[PDB]
Amino acid sequence: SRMEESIRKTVTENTVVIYSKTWCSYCTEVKTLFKRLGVQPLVVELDQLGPQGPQLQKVLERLTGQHTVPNVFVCGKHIGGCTDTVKLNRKGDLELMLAE
Ligand SMILES: N[C@@H](CCC(=O)N[C@@H](CS)C(=O)NCC(=O)O)C(=O)O
């Protein structure tokens, strides 16, 4: 699909991409973690896109294996959700990625 090719372009062009929903506490949490690191992520709020939201979500599951939000990409690579991102941070992998 065109939506799949567009996601690939979005995540290769933007250092941090968070596919989010505005009401989700885990999305807020991961937004805050990147803010504390000095990053300004690109946020895509899937609940604020009309019927494109659920279509995008389906393509995200095909690409990433995940059906929850947040769905986080760093340096073009899928990293997971909030707890995945927090674990990557706790290990210093997240900052090593950002540093390269
Ligand atoms: N363990 C996940 C949890 C994320 C989560 O539960 N997200 C909720 C929204 S706040 C969700 O996507 N729910 C949709 C569903 O369960 O299908 C993470 O750390 O990101």
Coordinates of N, CA and C and ligand atoms in Angstrom, one line a residue:
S1 N 0.8 -1.3 0.0 CA 0.0 0.0 0.0 C 0.8 1.3 0.0
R2 N 0.2 2.4 -0.5 CA 0.7 3.7 -0.4 C 0.9 4.2 1.0
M3 N 0.0 3.8 1.9 CA 0.2 4.2 3.3 C 1.5 3.5 3.9
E4 N 1.7 2.3 3.5 CA 3.0 1.6 4.0 C 4.2 2.3 3.5
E5 N 4.2 2.7 2.2 CA 5.4 3.4 1.7 C 5.5 4.8 2.4
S6 N 4.4 5.4 2.7 CA 4.4 6.7 3.4 C 5.0 6.6 4.8
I7 N 4.7 5.5 5.6 CA 5.2 5.4 6.9 C 6.7 5.2 6.8
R8 N 7.1 4.4 5.8 CA 8.6 4.2 5.7 C 9.3 5.5 5.4
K9 N 8.7 6.4 4.6 CA 9.3 7.7 4.4 C 9.3 8.6 5.6
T10 N 8.2 8.6 6.4 CA 8.1 9.4 7.6 C 9.2 9.0 8.6
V11 N 9.4 7.7 8.8 CA 10.3 7.3 9.9 C 11.8 7.4 9.4
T12 N 12.1 7.4 8.1 CA 13.5 7.6 7.7 C 13.8 9.1 7.6
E13 N 12.8 9.9 7.6 CA 13.1 11.4 7.4 C 13.1 12.1 8.8
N14 N 12.6 11.4 9.8 CA 12.4 12.1 11.2 C 13.1 11.2 12.2
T15 N 13.9 11.8 13.1 CA 14.8 11.1 14.0 C 13.9 10.3 14.9
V16 N 12.9 10.9 15.5 CA 12.0 10.1 16.4 C 10.6 10.3 16.0
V17 N 9.9 9.3 15.8 CA 8.5 9.3 15.4 C 7.7 8.6 16.4
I18 N 6.6 9.1 16.9 CA 5.7 8.5 17.9 C 4.3 8.4 17.3
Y19 N 3.8 7.2 16.9 CA 2.5 7.0 16.6 C 1.7 6.9 17.9
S20 N 0.7 7.8 18.1 CA 0.2 8.0 19.4 C -1.3 8.1 19.4
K21 N -1.9 8.1 20.6 CA -3.3 8.7 20.7 C -3.3 9.7 21.8
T22 N -4.1 10.7 21.7 CA -4.0 11.8 22.6 C -4.4 11.5 24.0
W23 N -5.3 10.5 24.2 CA -5.8 10.1 25.5 C -4.9 9.1 26.2
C24 N -3.9 8.5 25.5 CA -3.2 7.4 26.1 C -2.0 7.8 27.0
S25 N -2.1 7.4 28.3 CA -1.1 7.7 29.3 C 0.2 7.3 28.9
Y26 N 0.4 6.1 28.2 CA 1.7 5.6 27.9 C 2.3 6.4 26.8
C27 N 1.5 7.0 25.9 CA 1.9 8.0 24.9 C 2.4 9.2 25.5
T28 N 1.7 9.8 26.5 CA 2.1 11.0 27.2 C 3.4 10.7 27.9
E29 N 3.6 9.5 28.5 CA 4.8 9.2 29.2 C 6.0 9.1 28.3
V30 N 5.8 8.5 27.1 CA 7.0 8.4 26.2 C 7.3 9.8 25.6
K31 N 6.3 10.7 25.3 CA 6.5 12.0 24.9 C 7.4 12.8 25.9
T32 N 7.0 12.6 27.2 CA 7.8 13.3 28.3 C 9.2 12.8 28.3
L33 N 9.4 11.4 28.2 CA 10.8 10.9 28.2 C 11.6 11.6 27.1
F34 N 11.1 11.7 25.9 CA 11.9 12.3 24.8 C 12.1 13.8 25.1
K35 N 11.1 14.5 25.7 CA 11.3 15.9 26.0 C 12.4 16.0 27.0
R36 N 12.5 15.1 28.0 CA 13.5 15.2 29.1 C 14.9 15.0 28.5
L37 N 15.0 14.3 27.4 CA 16.2 14.0 26.6 C 16.6 15.1 25.7
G38 N 15.8 16.1 25.5 CA 16.0 17.2 24.5 C 15.6 16.9 23.1
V39 N 14.7 15.9 22.9 CA 14.3 15.6 21.6 C 12.9 16.2 21.3
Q40 N 12.6 16.6 20.1 CA 11.3 17.0 19.7 C 10.8 16.0 18.7
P41 N 10.0 15.0 19.2 CA 9.6 13.9 18.2 C 8.5 14.5 17.2
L42 N 8.4 13.8 16.1 CA 7.2 13.9 15.3 C 6.1 13.0 15.9
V43 N 5.0 13.6 16.2 CA 3.9 12.9 16.8 C 2.8 12.7 15.8
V44 N 2.2 11.6 15.6 CA 1.1 11.3 14.8 C 0.0 10.8 15.6
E45 N -1.1 11.6 15.9 CA -2.2 11.2 16.8 C -3.2 10.4 16.0
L46 N -3.2 9.1 16.1 CA -4.1 8.2 15.3 C -5.5 8.4 15.6
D47 N -5.9 8.9 16.8 CA -7.3 9.2 17.2 C -7.8 10.5 16.6
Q48 N -7.0 11.3 15.9 CA -7.4 12.6 15.4 C -7.2 12.6 13.9
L49 N -7.4 11.5 13.2 CA -7.2 11.5 11.7 C -8.5 10.9 11.0
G50 N -9.6 10.9 11.6 CA -10.8 10.3 11.0 C -10.6 8.8 10.7
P51 N -11.2 8.3 9.7 CA -11.0 6.9 9.3 C -9.5 6.6 8.9
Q52 N -8.7 7.6 8.6 CA -7.2 7.2 8.3 C -6.6 6.7 9.5
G53 N -7.0 7.0 10.7 CA -6.4 6.5 12.0 C -6.4 5.0 12.0
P54 N -7.5 4.3 11.9 CA -7.5 2.9 12.0 C -6.9 2.2 10.8
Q55 N -6.9 2.8 9.6 CA -6.2 2.3 8.5 C -4.7 2.4 8.7
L56 N -4.2 3.5 9.2 CA -2.8 3.6 9.5 C -2.4 2.6 10.6
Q57 N -3.2 2.4 11.6 CA -2.9 1.4 12.6 C -2.7 0.0 12.0
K58 N -3.6 -0.4 11.1 CA -3.4 -1.7 10.5 C -2.1 -1.8 9.8
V59 N -1.7 -0.8 9.0 CA -0.4 -0.8 8.4 C 0.7 -0.9 9.4
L60 N 0.6 -0.1 10.5 CA 1.6 -0.2 11.6 C 1.7 -1.6 12.1
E61 N 0.6 -2.3 12.3 CA 0.7 -3.7 12.8 C 1.4 -4.5 11.8
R62 N 1.2 -4.4 10.5 CA 1.8 -5.2 9.5 C 3.3 -4.9 9.5
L63 N 3.8 -3.7 9.7 CA 5.2 -3.3 9.7 C 5.9 -3.7 11.0
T64 N 5.2 -3.6 12.1 CA 5.9 -3.6 13.4 C 5.5 -4.7 14.3
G65 N 4.3 -5.4 14.1 CA 3.9 -6.5 14.9 C 3.2 -6.1 16.1
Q66 N 2.9 -4.8 16.3 CA 2.3 -4.2 17.5 C 1.0 -3.6 17.1
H67 N 0.0 -3.7 18.0 CA -1.3 -3.1 17.8 C -1.6 -2.0 18.9
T68 N -0.7 -1.7 19.8 CA -0.8 -0.7 20.8 C -0.1 0.6 20.4
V69 N -0.5 1.6 21.1 CA 0.2 2.9 21.0 C 0.8 3.1 22.4
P70 N 1.9 3.8 22.5 CA 2.7 4.4 21.4 C 3.4 3.4 20.6
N71 N 3.7 3.8 19.4 CA 4.5 2.9 18.5 C 5.6 3.8 18.0
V72 N 6.8 3.5 18.5 CA 8.0 4.4 18.5 C 9.0 4.0 17.5
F73 N 9.5 4.9 16.7 CA 10.7 4.7 15.8 C 11.8 5.7 16.2
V74 N 13.0 5.2 16.2 CA 14.2 6.0 16.4 C 15.2 5.7 15.3
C75 N 15.6 6.8 14.6 CA 16.6 6.6 13.5 C 16.1 5.6 12.5
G76 N 14.8 5.7 12.2 CA 14.2 4.8 11.2 C 13.8 3.4 11.6
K77 N 14.1 3.0 12.9 CA 14.0 1.7 13.3 C 12.9 1.6 14.4
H78 N 12.0 0.6 14.2 CA 11.0 0.4 15.3 C 11.6 0.0 16.6
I79 N 11.2 0.6 17.6 CA 11.8 0.3 18.9 C 10.7 -0.3 19.8
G80 N 9.4 -0.1 19.6 CA 8.4 -0.7 20.4 C 7.5 0.4 21.0
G81 N 7.0 0.1 22.2 CA 6.1 0.9 23.0 C 6.8 1.7 24.1
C82 N 6.0 2.1 25.1 CA 6.6 2.9 26.1 C 7.5 2.1 27.0
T83 N 7.1 1.0 27.5 CA 8.1 0.2 28.3 C 9.3 -0.2 27.5
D84 N 9.2 -0.5 26.2 CA 10.3 -0.8 25.4 C 11.3 0.3 25.4
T85 N 10.7 1.6 25.2 CA 11.5 2.8 25.2 C 12.2 3.1 26.5
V86 N 11.5 2.9 27.6 CA 12.1 3.1 28.9 C 13.2 2.1 29.1
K87 N 13.0 0.9 28.7 CA 14.1 -0.1 28.9 C 15.3 0.3 28.1
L88 N 15.1 0.7 26.9 CA 16.2 1.1 26.0 C 16.9 2.2 26.5
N89 N 16.2 3.2 27.1 CA 16.8 4.3 27.8 C 17.6 3.8 29.0
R90 N 17.1 3.0 29.9 CA 17.7 2.6 31.1 C 19.1 2.0 30.8
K91 N 19.2 1.3 29.6 CA 20.4 0.6 29.2 C 21.4 1.5 28.4
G92 N 21.0 2.8 28.1 CA 21.8 3.6 27.3 C 21.8 3.4 25.8
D93 N 21.1 2.4 25.4 CA 20.9 2.1 24.0 C 20.2 3.3 23.3
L94 N 19.2 3.9 23.9 CA 18.5 5.0 23.3 C 19.4 6.1 23.0
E95 N 20.2 6.6 24.0 CA 21.1 7.7 23.7 C 22.2 7.3 22.7
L96 N 22.7 6.0 22.7 CA 23.7 5.6 21.7 C 23.0 5.7 20.3
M97 N 21.8 5.3 20.2 CA 21.2 5.4 18.9 C 21.1 6.9 18.5
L98 N 20.6 7.8 19.4 CA 20.5 9.2 19.1 C 21.8 9.8 18.7
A99 N 22.9 9.4 19.3 CA 24.3 9.9 19.1 C 24.9 9.4 17.8
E100 N 24.2 8.6 17.0 CA 24.7 8.0 15.8 C 23.8 8.2 14.6
Ligands
LIG1 N1 3.1 -2.1 27.2 C1 2.6 -1.1 26.2 C2 1.2 -0.6 26.6 C3 0.5 0.3 25.7 C4 -1.0 0.4 25.8 O1 -1.6 -0.5 26.5 N2 -1.6 1.2 25.0 C5 -3.0 1.3 24.9 C6 -3.5 2.8 24.9 S1 -3.0 3.8 26.4 C7 -3.5 0.7 23.6 O2 -2.9 0.8 22.5 N3 -4.7 0.0 23.6 C8 -5.3 -0.6 22.5 C9 -5.5 -2.0 22.5 O3 -5.2 -2.7 23.6 O4 -5.8 -2.6 21.5 C10 3.6 0.0 26.2 O5 4.5 0.0 27.1 O6 3.5 0.9 25.3

